[PDB]
Structure 1
Amino acid sequence: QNYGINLPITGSMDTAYANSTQEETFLTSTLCLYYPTEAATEINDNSWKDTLSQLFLTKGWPTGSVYFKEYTDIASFSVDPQLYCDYNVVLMKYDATLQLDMSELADLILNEWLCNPMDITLYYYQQTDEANKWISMGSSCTIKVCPLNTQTLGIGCLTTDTATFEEVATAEKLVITDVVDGVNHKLDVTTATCTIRNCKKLGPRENVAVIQVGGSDVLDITADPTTAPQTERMMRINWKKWWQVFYTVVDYVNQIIQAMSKRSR
C-alpha cells in the first residue's frame, strides 16, 4: 500500500473480462442530485423525494443511498459549491444572460482545482502556465487588474489611482480570471465580501455530471478559444416539464454513472 508514490503497473491481454460491478457499486456508493427550486415549485408535492427513492430502488440504488440537495439559483450554487458525495448529478437551467456564469460553474465542478490562497495588499501576482487561473467566490466581486512592466510600473494604469485599473468583473458571485502569463498584476478586489484563490487546473473530476436542461450546448470548459470541447459527462436535455426530466434521469441513471467514475484524489 505504497501511497505518496507512483509505480509502473503491468498486466496482460489474455485475462477475461470480469463480472458486472453494477448492482454492487450502487449498494456501496451514494448518489446526490442537485435540482433547482423551480422543479419542486412546479411539482408542488411533499413526497416526490420518497417517490424518486422508491423508483431508484427498482434500478438497484437502495433507499438511503440517494440524496437531494436544493439550490435556489445557479449563482447561489456557484457561491462555494461543496460537492461531497460518491456520484453527483447537477441539473442546470439555461439562460443566455447567465451563460458565462454557468460555464464557470462547469469549469469549477467538472474539474479538480488545486487552490492556493492569495493576499493582494502585500504581493503582485503573475501566472506561470495556461491552467493557473484566479477563481473568485463571494456575494459581489468587483475585480480590477493593472499589469506591470519589467520595472514595476503600470501599463495604461497607475499604481495609486485604482480608477485607472482595468475591470474584468463587476458584481459577480463567481469569477474565473485568466490573464497574460508572464506579467505581474496588481489587483483590486472586494476582500470583505469576496475571497480570491490562485488555482491550478489538474486533471478532471470524474465524480460530477452536469445536465443542461434547455438550450443548445454552449459550455466552453477549456478557457483557450481553440478546443470548445464537449466532455462525456456534459449532458443536454430539452424540457417542458420536470417530472419527465426526473423520470429520464432515473431510467438512464446507469448510463450516467457509466459516464462518471469514482474519484482518484
Structure 2
Amino acid sequence: QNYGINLPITGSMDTAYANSTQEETFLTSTLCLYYPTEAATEINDNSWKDTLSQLFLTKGWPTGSVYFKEYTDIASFSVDPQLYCDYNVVLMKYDATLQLDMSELADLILNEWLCNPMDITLYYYQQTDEANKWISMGSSCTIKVCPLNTQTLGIGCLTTDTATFEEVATAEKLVITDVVDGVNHKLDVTTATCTIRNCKKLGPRENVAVIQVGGSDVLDITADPTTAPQTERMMRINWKKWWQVFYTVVDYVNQIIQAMSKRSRSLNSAAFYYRI
C-alpha cells in the first residue's frame, strides 16, 4: 500500500512459527528447468518432459506449473537469458575450457544488475565503484579499452587509433568488464554485433539457482580476487547419465527451492523501487 517508502519492521521474538508454506508455494508458483540440448539428446525420449512433469506432481507441483526450457550451450544461453519463472534452476554443464564464461553466466543470472545504456561513440566511461561493471552481450563482443589521464589523453594508447587500445574481450557472447575505477576509458566495441551496458550490482538474485553438472567448484561470481563465495544457490553434482541428473533434481526439488527465495524485486512490495 505504502510504496517507495522504507518503513522499519518491529516483530517480536516470541511469536510462534507458522505452518509450512511449501505446499502453498508449490501450488501457486511456477518452476523453470534450463538444460543443455545434449541432455535431451542423451535422454532420447519424446515424452520425457511429461514424465518429469508427472514426477514433479508427485512432489506436489500442479501439472503445467513446471516449464522445461532448452539452450544449445553456455555461449548461446549467455545472450541475455530471460528467466521468468517464479523459481529458476539452470542445469549448467561444466567445461574446463569455459570456466570464466561459466562464472560470467552465473554472475549475470545469480545477481541483480541495474543497467543503463552506453554510447561508446559519444561519451567516455568510468566505473564509479566496485559494484559497477560493463556487461556486454550479443553475437560477438570485442571490447578494446583506452584508459585516459586527466588530460583526456590515452595512457599507453591513442584516442584516434583504436589499434593501440587494450583488448579485454574477443568474440565473446557475454563478458563482464571490470576496469580501474575513477578512470575515463575510451571504448571501441563491435556495437553492430553486440551491445554494452553500464551495470550496477544491486545484490543477489534469489529465484535463480545454478546446478553445475560435473567438474569442481570453479565459479567466481565476484570480481574481487579476495572473495570467491560459493552461495547456497550454486550446487554441484557428479553425473554420468542425464536421467540420473533429472531424477536427482526432481527428488530434491524441496531442497533446491529452499535454497531459493521469491524474487525480492519482482513482487508487489517492490512497486516504485524498481518494479511491480
Answer whether TM exceeds 0.5 for this pair: yes
Give CA deviations for 1:1-40 in whole Å, capped at 9, x if unaligned: 1011101101111110010001110010000000110011
Give CA deviations for 1:95-131 in whole Å, capped at 9, x if unaligned: 1111111100000000010000000111101111001
What residue number does 2:102 align with?
102
User: Gaps (5+ residues) in structure 2?
Assistant: 266-276
User: Gaps (5+ residues) in structure 1?
Assistant: none
- Tell me, in whole angstroms, the C-alpha distance in 2 between the residues paired with 1:187 and 1:112: 24
1:56 offset after TM fit, Å?
0.6
- Tell me, in whole angstroms, the C-alpha distance in 1 between the residues paired with 2:13 and 2:104: 41
| Secondary structure of the structure 1 residue equivalent to 2:138 | strand
TM-score by length of 2: 0.95
Aligned length: 265
- Tell me, in whole angstroms, the C-alpha distance in 2 between the residues paired with 1:261 and 1:122: 40
Give CA deviations for 1:54-97 in whole Å, capped at 9, x if unaligned: 10111100111000000011010001111111000000011111
1:203 offset after TM fit, Å?
1.3
- Tell me, in whole angstroms, the C-alpha distance in 2 between the residues paired with 1:174 and 1:74: 10
- Tell me, in whole angstroms, the C-alpha distance in 2 between the residues paired with 1:82 and 1:185: 30
Matches within 5 A, 1:165-244: 165-244=165-244
TM-score by length of 1: 0.99
1:211 offset after TM fit, Å?
0.2
Identity among equivalent positions (%) equals 100
| Secondary structure of the structure 2 residue equivalent to 1:42 | helix
- Tell me, in whole angstroms, the C-alpha distance in 1 between the residues paired with 2:181 and 2:233: 30
Q: Could you list the runs of 4 or more consecutive aligned residues of structure 1 that deviate by over 4 angstroms after TM superposition?
A: none
- Tell me, in whole angstroms, the C-alpha distance in 1 between the residues paired with 2:203 and 2:152: 34
| Secondary structure of the structure 1 residue equivalent to 2:64 | helix
- Tell me, in whole angstroms, the C-alpha distance in 2 between the residues paired with 1:155 and 1:23: 59
| Secondary structure of the structure 2 residue equivalent to 1:9 | coil
What residue number does 1:3 align with?
3
| Secondary structure of the structure 2 residue equivalent to 1:127 | coil
1:239 offset after TM fit, Å?
0.4
- Tell me, in whole angstroms, the C-alpha distance in 1 between the residues paired with 2:121 and 2:14: 61
